[PDB]
Design an enzyme around this catalytic site. Structure first.
Site, short mmCIF file in Angstrom:
data_model
loop_
_atom_site.label_atom_id
_atom_site.label_comp_id
_atom_site.label_asym_id
_atom_site.label_seq_id
_atom_site.Cartn_x
_atom_site.Cartn_y
_atom_site.Cartn_z
N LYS A 112 -8.50 -4.38 -7.48
CA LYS A 112 -7.78 -3.53 -6.53
C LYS A 112 -7.61 -4.20 -5.17
O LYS A 112 -6.66 -3.91 -4.46
CB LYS A 112 -8.47 -2.17 -6.40
CG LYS A 112 -7.44 -1.01 -6.37
CD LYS A 112 -7.94 0.30 -7.01
CE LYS A 112 -6.81 1.16 -7.64
NZ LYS A 112 -6.63 0.91 -9.08
N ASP A 123 -5.11 6.92 -2.06
CA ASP A 123 -5.60 8.20 -2.60
C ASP A 123 -5.90 9.29 -1.57
O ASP A 123 -5.70 10.49 -1.87
CB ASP A 123 -6.85 7.92 -3.40
CG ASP A 123 -6.52 7.08 -4.64
OD1 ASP A 123 -5.44 7.29 -5.17
OD2 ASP A 123 -7.34 6.30 -5.05
N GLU A 150 -3.40 11.48 -3.49
CA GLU A 150 -3.28 11.40 -4.94
C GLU A 150 -3.00 12.82 -5.46
O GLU A 150 -3.41 13.82 -4.85
CB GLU A 150 -4.60 10.81 -5.53
CG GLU A 150 -4.67 10.69 -7.00
CD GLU A 150 -3.59 9.74 -7.55
OE1 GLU A 150 -3.82 8.48 -7.60
OE2 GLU A 150 -2.52 10.29 -7.94
#
Ligand SMILES: O=C(NCCc1ccccc1)c1nc([C@@H]2CCCN2C(=O)c2c(Cl)cccc2Cl)[nH]c(=O)c1O
Ligand SMILES: [Mn+2]
Ligand SMILES: [Mn+2]
Ligand code: NA
Length: 178
Positions: A115, A89, A61
């Site tokens: 998610k 991420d 990320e």
């Protein structure tokens, strides 16, 4: 709340957050809760990556898209892990798995499911934090030790308290969408 964000978060985080918003045509001076939320997710991702041994994590990320995928594709080649459909991420070299980090203003289980459906890449591990101290992770596997997770949870709590002291918290808490 714009002044809150600029005061509360490191300038690198704030610059990454402004760029992310602008790339989708949003103005950080107007969508200020979104501004804060993105800042928060970034800071949680950076704290997580500092959470273990040195070199335990790779940060994905917060990179521009070309460099983020260069990292992911590199890792898939040197370890053989499956390539995710969308950018995660972090990568965890110890457990050999990608990690999706979530930070939620609602509660952790609804966000975890979302998610799970959103990513659905069966291999990526999901770890969610709230602002009130709950966490939720895949297969109840929390990756970091209690000390590290405690530091993250304490930081989100501080942000919540600081927003409320400025009377920004109620609008922020209600601004997250499914
Ligand atoms: O990697 C992420 N985003 C990659 C790029 C991307 C962009 C759009 C959709 C999918 C992926 C990412 N994103 C979000 C949340 C939910 C999806 C959007 N979003 C944002 O923060 C966000 C950003 Cl980036 C820019 C403008 C506005 C927003 Cl609301 N939550 C995460 O936990 C996360 O890891
Ligand atoms: Mn991400
Ligand atoms: Mn994330
Ligand atoms: Na995502």
């Amino acid at each position: 709340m714009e002044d809150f964000v600029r005061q509360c978060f490191n300038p690198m985080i704030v610059e990454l957050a402004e760029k992310a918003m602008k790339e989708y045509g949003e103005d950080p001076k107007i969508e200020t809760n979104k501004f804060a939320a993105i800042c928060t997710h970034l800071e949680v991702c950076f704290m997580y990556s500092d959470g273990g041994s040195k070199h335990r994590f790779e940060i994905i990320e917060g990179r521009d898209r070309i460099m983020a995928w260069t990292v992911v594709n590199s890792i898939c080649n040197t370890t053989g892990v499956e390539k995710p459909k969308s950018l995660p991420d972090l990568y965890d070299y110890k457990e050999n798995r990608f990690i999706e980090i979530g930070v939620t203003r609602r509660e952790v289980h609804i966000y975890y499911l979302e998610k799970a459906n959103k990513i659905k890449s069966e291999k990526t591990h999901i770890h969610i934090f709230s602002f009130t101290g709950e966490e939720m992770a895949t297969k109840a596997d929390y990756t970091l030790d209690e000390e590290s997770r405690a530091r993250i949870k304490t930081r989100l709590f501080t942000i919540r308290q600081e927003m409320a002291s400025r009377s920004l918290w109620d609008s922020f808490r209600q601004s997250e969408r499914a």
